[PDB]
Amino acid sequence: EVQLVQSGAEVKKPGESLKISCQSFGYIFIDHTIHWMRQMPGQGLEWMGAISPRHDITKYNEMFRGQVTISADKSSSTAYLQWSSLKASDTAMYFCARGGFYGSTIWFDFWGQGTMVTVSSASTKGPSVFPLAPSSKSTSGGTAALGCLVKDYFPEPVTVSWNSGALTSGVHTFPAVLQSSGLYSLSSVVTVPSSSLGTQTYICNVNHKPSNTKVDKRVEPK
């Protein structure tokens, strides 16, 4: 069936150029138009522009004209979106979606899965992992909390498991925050029986693939 497949996540510096892509499968490429949508972090959707590969005609939203170029390659059924000079404010998720022409009544019925673009002055950096140790100040009833602070890494993402995936109940891994450095930072916490605490070993397994940083941090009481 119809699939639109986008290229992988991108991390860039301001001023750098970038071309991302969307390849169509399962239908005739020249029978439709391909449109590009921006979704800035935590925001809604914006239509950037579109191309008819059949007619080699592009249309742009006035707010994006001169900032980006949309193009297509009929031979590989691929559409492209490109910037010649990225800005930090271009940080967003980018989606391609299928549509029709003047007179068509169905818009964006199939979408790519979409492509994250991060633009920052920051450079790749692995996190430091610090314990958030259980004590009395973190023992509600017969419930204790503990965690790991995964501090000062770039870019996203990091993954965290507990006890190599054996501990899943009561785990909360928070969305990362972007610090004024920034460097991202997140915490992962788990609530456990206070009678734990004690006799059960708690280890957070942290993986930051961009810097190839992998850390197993034992978290002990007091």
Binding site: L45, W47, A97, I106, F108, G147, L149, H172, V189
Partner: protein, 213 residues
């Protein structure tokens, strides 16, 4: 461009409830209103296309109405998978323009947070920085006020918060607040307090520690 005004931005409802969301356009767009659902981390999904046409495979609990400038989407008998963000889209004229979205949240009973405070670790202190963390665990509704006090001085602009998505099992939220100071500043003060205000608490809850102890 045609401006699209979607309301409400946020709506709580119970599983099984019926809700109606509206979109108003600044120009007459005839029947060219389209509705999308988007879950976190996913592409939007087309539900209904121009002329109130439900897309193949979309449940009939989704219906829409409207012509000209005023439009609605009704979801009947809300299922757990329905609690996502909805966007309207006008496809009358270029540029295509979308409403700002409606996030639907699962309504449940009030639950007060359990609150925990974590002093900075000795390992972190060795590197010249101190992060103090306050955790509010498993609470509802999402609205919560967290105030940091260092020797009774209210900290402002000094902290960052992060909130989880609504839990798929109990429909609660959790929140962390991190207060960041220099090692130097951390060591010149004694009492570190996180004060939490929430509708599930009859009065604010304070968690604190004295540095050293």
């Amino acid at each position: 461009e045609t401006t699209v005004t979607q309301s409400p931005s946020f709506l709580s409802a119970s599983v099984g409830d019926r809700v109606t969301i509206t979109c108003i356009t600044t120009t007459d767009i005839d029947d060219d209103m389209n509705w999308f659902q988007q879950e976190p981390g996913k592409a939007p999904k087309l539900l209904i296309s121009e002329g109130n046409i439900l897309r193949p495979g979309v449940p009939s609990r989704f219906s829409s109405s409207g012509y000209g400038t005023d439009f609605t989407l009704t979801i009947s008998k809300l299922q757990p998978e329905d609690f996502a963000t909805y966007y309207c889209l006008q496809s009358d004229n270029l540029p295509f323009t979308f409403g700002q979205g409606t996030k639907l949240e699962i309504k449940r009973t009030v639950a007060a947070p359990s609150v925990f405070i974590f002093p900075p670790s000795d390992e972190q202190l060795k590197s010249g920085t101190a992060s103090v963390v306050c955790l509010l665990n498993n609470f509802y509704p999402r609205e919560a006020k967290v105030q940091w006090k260092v020797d009774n001085a209210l900290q402002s602009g000094n902290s960052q918060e992060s909130v989880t998505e609504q839990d798929s099992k109990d429909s609660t939220y959790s929140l962390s607040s991190t207060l960041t100071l220099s090692k130097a500043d951390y060591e010149k003060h004694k009492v570190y307090a996180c004060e939490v205000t929430h509708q599930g608490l009859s009065s604010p809850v304070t968690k604190s520690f004295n540095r050293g102890e």
